Symmetry: C3
Subunit: 123 residues, 3 copies
């Protein structure tokens, strides 16, 4: 899984950034069973004032988490994962849930490469 994580610059110290990546990665490993190192967390920082809720410019306190996932998981499991992510990030990032957005997109594992290797192959 890859998690693009969109955040403002000077908002997450280079530490709660570790706390958050570990939050995401540990929820994922523990709900899905995917081995730790298969879980990538990629932070996309942008200057504050680059997010707009309703066409209103916001401060720097928004976290969007966009997970790119393989198919096969269930509404239920993915619901547990999104909630667990909102929460652990809430703490790790010492930010409140209402600032966290979480979107999962799914993809056939045939079209996902990790470590240069395919997850599922035509074979």
């Amino acid at each position: 899984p890859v998690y693009m994580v969109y955040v403002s610059q000077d908002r997450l110290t280079p530490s709660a950034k570790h706390a958050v990546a570990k939050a995401i990665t540990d929820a994922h490993r523990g709900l899905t069973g995917t081995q730790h190192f298969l879980a990538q967390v990629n932070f996309q920082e942008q200057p504050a004032g680059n997010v707009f809720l309703g066409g209103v410019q916001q401060g720097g306190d928004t976290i969007f988490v966009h997970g790119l996932h393989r198919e096969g998981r269930s509404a239920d499991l993915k619901g547990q994962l999104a909630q667990r992510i909102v929460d652990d990030v809430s703490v790790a990032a010492e930010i409140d849930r209402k600032h966290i957005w979480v979107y999962f997109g799914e993809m056939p594992a045939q079209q996902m490469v990790e470590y240069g290797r395919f997850l599922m192959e035509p074979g």
Copy 2:
């Protein structure tokens, strides 16, 4: 809905950036009926010369708009929305349509969190 909006740095002033977010958000609210504040617009700026059309490096005058949407809308409505977005951004950004690209991706609303809350839940 979340709209990642990819643009070069020093191209959109911190103003036409408001004009564009409002463009996107108002087209969306008015074609789909989603309440204003549920519409997030997230700007991803990169230095100019970071986009390549055909493996040719371009200036800073490209806008890519990547919408992350829930399912259920129609080809028709989404076509109207993409066109309306190309246009209003064309003006707001005082940029021409040929520079704007618009891609919608869809996702079950069960796997979309806004304001820490799920849109549709297992329930």
Copy 3:
């Protein structure tokens, strides 16, 4: 097709960046037959230490390639494309395959705008 390409800053010179965009774009044109200029490559640079494999912070030597594609291609063709991309980038970027991740997402061409024009239209 659009290829978001996520990379650390001061890792790809403004040259192997051309080499990589051309790598991606030429694999795509030659496996799929899409005309050169329809192939966008968009580089998203972030400071090093912004990627986490397993909740472990990595250097600046990770390339994630996220392709946004129209539907209709096959597991087979897309597998060839992901592999060809991992490889040509491996060389162009003088980086090893284990650092490259490749994820394709698919979208009805009705909801993809290139150059302000729709790929397929309701019509």
